């Protein structure tokens, strides 16, 4: 039960694996996100698919991780959000469980990321002024 | 050749009695039935 390798090349094949194993197949999921009674439905579907992708891209770009699939930042991990160790998260849990556990504290992290990115940009401009 | 990807060690929650696809199918069937009858003869003179 230990010392076995698992590799997935499907769309959502890694949905049932651990976070660490599932973090190696992000591109396969990234590709798919973009792509008279029935024509209007098709048009609305296309518009909605474009809108959601554009919203996600804008949100990613605001934090400074534009054009990246893995990007760590300057914001420290507040211990109030979670208390487990890295050994029990990346090797003892799945992404779905983590999302279910952390969904209460999502917006605060987003605001902190935006503020930190703005401060970093201002500091970079000040440094380049010299 | 349709593509199907089995998900291993994944258990989901299902409920047939609250599916929204049934309402959509009903609405589309009714809409198609109504649309197909638009270019056809009206039997107004038959009420004699």
């Amino acid at each position, epitope marked *: 039960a230990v010392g*076995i390798g698992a*590799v997935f*090349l499907g769309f959502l*094949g890694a949905a049932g694996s651990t976070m660490g194993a599932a973090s*190696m197949t992000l591109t396969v999921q990234a590709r798919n996100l973009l792509s008279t009674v029935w024509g209007i439905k098709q048009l609305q579907a296309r518009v909605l698919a474009v809108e959601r992708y554009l919203r996600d891209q804008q949100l990613l770009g605001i934090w400074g991780c534009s054009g990246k699939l893995i990007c760590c930042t300057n914001v420290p991990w507040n211990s109030s959000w979670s208390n487990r160790n890295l050994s029990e998260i990346w090797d003892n849990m799945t992404w779905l469980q983590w999302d279910k556990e952390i969904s209460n504290y999502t917006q605060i992290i987003y605001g902190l990321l935006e503020e930190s990115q703005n401060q970093q940009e201002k500091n970079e401009q000040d440094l380049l002024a010299l | 050749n349709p593509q199907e990807i089995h998900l291993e060690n994944v258990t989901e929650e299902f409920n047939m009695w609250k599916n929204n696809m049934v309402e959509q199918m009903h609405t589309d069937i009714i809409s198609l039935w109504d649309q197909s009858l638009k270019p056809c003869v009206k039997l107004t003179p038959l009420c004699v």
Partner: nanobody
Amino acid sequence: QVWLRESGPGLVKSSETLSLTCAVSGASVGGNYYWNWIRQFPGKGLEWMGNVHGGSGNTEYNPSLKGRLTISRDTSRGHFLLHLDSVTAADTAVYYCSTQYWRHTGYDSSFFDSWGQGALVTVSS
């Protein structure tokens, strides 16, 4: 298919450090793979020395070889290295690097196993 090739010095003096290199072709060392080092002594049974996970980097060693065996990876060069300190005459053996993994390609799952030809190491002064 994952191909593994062993390499290293053919002779190591007693009490020195034996270094071995296993090169992987057809797969990335940084993937979700387990790479195992196993030695077979002459005219005897096999013995699993250790293994390492390519992704996280956790290394697991046999208790008998603990304290003298170190297995490391190299993603940039795509190969993994093995170090055994204080090699004695009893350490002469044929070393192999192997791997096992499940491949879940869409609908179908398949178990794959790969071994190398192996390298003979003789320990003597």
